[PDB]
């Protein structure tokens, strides 16, 4: 219900809680049960399940005139960022029900 400024980001906490991502995608508000690409190869490993529950904002602009190995431009100022890039990403628009 409350989406304040950067100082008051929301949080889900792992405490007295049980439901799978199956329940989360079974709803009509969301419409996917993946990210844009996860299959039997290359990043995820210890015997372990999911992602932890924290929320933040990052940036990724300069990628097209780019072949990696050096320093970027955008993802610095208001929150610190690591470097490693691989895995699953979901991002698309929504402008209807609010």
């Amino acid at each position: 219900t409350r989406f304040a400024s950067v100082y008051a980001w929301n949080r889900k906490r792992i405490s007295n809680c049980v439901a799978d991502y199956s329940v989360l995608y079974n709803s009509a508000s969301f419409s996917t049960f993946k990210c844009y690409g996860v299959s039997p190869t290359k990043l995820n490993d210890l015997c372990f399940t999911n992602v932890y529950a924290d929320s933040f904002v990052i940036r990724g602009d300069e990628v097209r005139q780019i072949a990696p190995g050096q320093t970027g431009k955008i993802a610095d100022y208001n929150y610190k960022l690591p470097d490693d890039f691989t895995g699953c990403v979901i991002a698309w628009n929504s402008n209807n029900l609010d």
């Binding site: 844009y36 690409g37 996860v38 299959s39 039997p40 190869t41 290359k42 990043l43 995820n44 490993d45 490693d84 691989t86 895995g87 699953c88």
Partner: protein, 97 residues
């Protein structure tokens, strides 16, 4: 005879050749097994890093780098073994003569 028995019992540094012969092979094997933990430009180096974790149409262009990076490590090892055996043969012929 007693003199040489006592001298051999005393001096421990006469068997350096026989020691280093085994040491070289042990070190080579240790290096070869250790090499598996290198990323070779990928994100991860575990053997599991090609098993259960990311999509085909972007990971097939990534696993190839790892598989082609792991082969020269075998090539160098076999060449080294070839050279070592080549010289050991001449040593053995000299001993037999």
């Amino acid at each position: 005879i007693g003199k040489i028995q006592d001298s051999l019992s005393s001096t421990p540094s006469a068997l350096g050749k026989l020691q280093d012969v085994v040491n070289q092979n042990a070190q080579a094997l240790n290096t070869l097994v250790k090499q598996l933990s290198s990323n070779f430009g990928a994100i991860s180096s575990v053997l599991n890093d090609i098993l259960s974790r990311l999509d085909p149409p972007e990971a097939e262009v990534q696993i190839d780098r790892l598989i082609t990076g792991r082969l020269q490590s075998l090539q160098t090892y076999v060449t080294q073994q070839l050279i070592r055996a080549a010289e050991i043969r001449a040593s053995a012929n000299l001993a037999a003569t």
